[PDB]
Structures are given as C-alpha cells and as structure tokens.
Amino acid sequence: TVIKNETGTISISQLNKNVWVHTELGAVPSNGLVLNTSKGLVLVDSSWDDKLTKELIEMVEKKFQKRVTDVIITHAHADCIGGIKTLKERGIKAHSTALTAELAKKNGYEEPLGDLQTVTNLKFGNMKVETFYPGKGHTEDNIVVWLPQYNILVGGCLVKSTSAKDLGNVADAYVNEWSTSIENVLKRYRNINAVVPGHGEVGDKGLLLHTLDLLK
Numbered sequence: 257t258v259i260k261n262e263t264g265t266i267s268i269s270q271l272n273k274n275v276w277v278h279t280e281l282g283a284v285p286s287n288g289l290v291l292n293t294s295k296g297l298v299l300v301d302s303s304w305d306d307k308l309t310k311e312l313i314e315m316v317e318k319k320f321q322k323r324v325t326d327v328i329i330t331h332a333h334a335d336c337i338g339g340i341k342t343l344k345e346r347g348i349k350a351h352s353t354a355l356t357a358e359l360a361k362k363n364g365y366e367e368p369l370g371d372l373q374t375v376t377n378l379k380f381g382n383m384k385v386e387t388f389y390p391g392k393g394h395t396e397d398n399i400v401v402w403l404p405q406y407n408i409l410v411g412g413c414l415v416k417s418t419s420a421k422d423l424g425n426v427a428d429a430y431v432n433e434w435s436t437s438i439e440n441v442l443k444r445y446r447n448i449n450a451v452v453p454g455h456g457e458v459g460d461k462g463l464l465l466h467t468l469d470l471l472k
C-alpha cells in the first residue's frame with residue numbers, strides 16, 4: 257500500500273503492519289519512518305522544510321486518525337530537521353542526541369530535546385525503538401534507529417542506496433571514520449532483515465557493505 261499527495265512530492269509506503277516509510281521530494285527524495293502505535297504516531301525524521309513537514313504530518317494524522325506524538329531526529333541536516341518549527345508548535349516531542357541539538361542551533365534551526373544517549377530504548381505502546389550513535393560518518397552526529405521486533409534498521413544518510421555511487425555532501429562528513437562507524441553498526445546488529453537508506457529504496461545488510469565499498 258502506497259499513499260501520495262496530489263502533487264506527488266510526498267508518499268508513504270507500508271513496510272509491515274505498523275511500519276511505513278515516508279518519502280518527500282525536495283527533485284531530491286528523502287526517507288523516514290512512520291510508526292503506527294496504540295498510543296499515537298511516531299516518526300523517524302521530519303522533512304526538508306516546515307511546509308512539507310506540516311503536509312506529511314497532516315497526511316498521516318488523517319490516515320491513521322491519531323496524533324503524531326514523537327519524532328526521532330537522526331541528524332542536523334534539512335532533510336531530517338527541516339520542520340522542527342512545525343513539530344514544536346504542534347506539541348510533538350523532537351528527540352535527538354545532545355550533539356544533534358547543538359549542531360541544530362548552529363545551523364539556524366530551533367533546538368530538539370537532546371535527550372538521546374549513545375544507546376536509548378523507547379517504547380511507544382507495543383512498538384519498541386532503539387537509537388544508536390555509531391560514531392562520526394555522514395555527519396558528526398548521525399545516529400541509526402533499530403526496530404528489534406522486526407529487525408529493521410534505519411540507516412539514514414550513513415547508508416547509501418543500491419544505485420548510489422556518490423556519498424553526497426561530505427563537507428560536514430568524517431569520511432575516514434565513516435567506515436568504522438558502519439562497522440560498529442554491523443557488530444551491534446548481527447541479524448538484520450531490512451535496511452532503510454537515507455535516500456533510495458529499502459534494502460538489506462548489503463547496503464551497508466555497498467556503502468563501505470564506496471568509502472574504500
């Protein structure tokens with residue numbers, strides 16, 4: 257099941273029962289997750305800006321007839337924290353590491369909570385979510401998200417898609433450490449099923465290996 261807005265700039269694809277992938281075009285696509293829980297909707301990453309973020313939120317709240325209660329910000333770039341102003345005015349908790357919170361302020365964005373530690377486990381209803389900071393890579397602050405009940409890993413921009421031959425913006429990246437950080441993710445999660453890249457189609461652990469290949 258895939259749902260889109262009339263313009264086609266926002267789509268939501270179902271991965272499983274309560275897990276969907278949201279994609280917005282900035283055209284340049286960016287992925288995130290929508291988790292449908294018994295106590296509201298939880299998103300992994302917002303969108304490019306406040307307009308798209310508001311649209312995304314309105315779209316999912318209308319579909320599931322629930323409130324978006326929390327959002328996990330994976331790093332301080334527009335495709336992830338672009339709609340932070342929209343989140344705060346709607347009472348949506350914007351979770352992030354302390355580092356992401358300070359880099360956000362530095363990039364002219366309002367500040368997220370800065371509550372996430374290196375390993376943080378959250379439970380929304382019956383939905384379990386684990387956030388993990390593997391080290392510097394695409395950015396100094398990038399984190400990954402793990403759904404242990406499904407063995408689904410949200411790689412974010414730390415992971416490139418199968419067709420990608422470019423690492424993207426590396427002005428804020430730590431290219432040399434990036435490989436070590438991906439290795440930390442591989443060592444931590446031994447049995448991965450699906451892997452969601454920052455941009456592109458959902459794949460498997462092969463995407464992490466592919467990214468390591470690009471980094472060589």
Ligand SMILES: [Zn+2]
Binds near residue numbers: 331333395413
């Ligand atoms: Zn980025």
Ligand SMILES: [Zn+2]
Binds near residue numbers: 335412424454
């Ligand atoms: Zn990216």
